[PDB]
Design a binder for these strands. Structure first.
Lengths: 53, 49, 53
DNA sequence: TTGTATTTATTGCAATTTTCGTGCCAATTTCTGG
DNA sequence: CCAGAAATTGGCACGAAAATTGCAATAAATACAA
């Protein structure tokens, strides 16, 4: 009983148009984003204590 | 389907409530024999080891 | 030398990172190996010698 | 017109530890002549 | 068949080269007040 365990690659290599090309695995590339709500909350007329934070 | 020689009569309760009585000669002539095909698959993958 | 960086950066980048090729899944550190001499004057990797053995 | 405060752009050096190939030789296994 | 000789193997050692890890604030560009 049991099952094999796999590993997710980080870079993929394939032969295209007779030459080898290398790309990143898009399923595992980490990415982030800035929350636009709190970012747009930066009002100058608002209290400085919140603005500096 | 197939063309069958049929009689309309009761036969000892073997066609009671939509039952059908069939001759052995029908079976011996392969008149309602069918062919069924099934598919099986084996996949070889790549592991870390 | 090829990518114009320091050897420490190359060492750190290629750590616990994998690559998928039509032949299999290899760690990025699998492609660095020592060598011995050759009668012609060139060099032969230790991986090739192990495969030949 | 300029000197100055604020924001992007910097992904290497230097010890130190680890791995490389290859020689020496004790212990072990294989070989051959009388 | 026997026993000495010869080939085989791997633990230890040597220097040399290669890989790993600690170090924590600045250079420069740009917009603003006299």
């Amino acid at each position: 009983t049991g099952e094999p365990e796999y590993v997710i690659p980080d870079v993929l290599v394939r032969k295209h148009n007779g030459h080898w090309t290398v790309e990143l695995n898009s399923d595992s590339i980490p990415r982030l984003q800035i929350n636009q709500h709190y970012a747009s909350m930066c009002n100058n007329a608002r209290n400085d204590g919140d603005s500096q934070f | 389907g197939q063309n069958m020689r049929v009689a309309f009569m009761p036969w000892n309760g073997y066609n009671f409530e939509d039952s059908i009585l069939v001759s052995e000669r029908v079976v011996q002539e392969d008149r309602f024999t069918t062919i069924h095909i099934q598919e099986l698959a084996c996949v070889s993958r790549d592991t870390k080891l | 030398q090829a990518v114009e960086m320091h050897e420490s950066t190359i060492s750190r980048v290629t750590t616990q990172k994998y690559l998928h090729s039509p032949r299999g899944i290899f760690e990025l550190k699998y492609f660095f190996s020592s060598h011995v001499n050759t009668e012609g004057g060139g060099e032969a990797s230790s991986t090739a010698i192990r495969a030949l053995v």
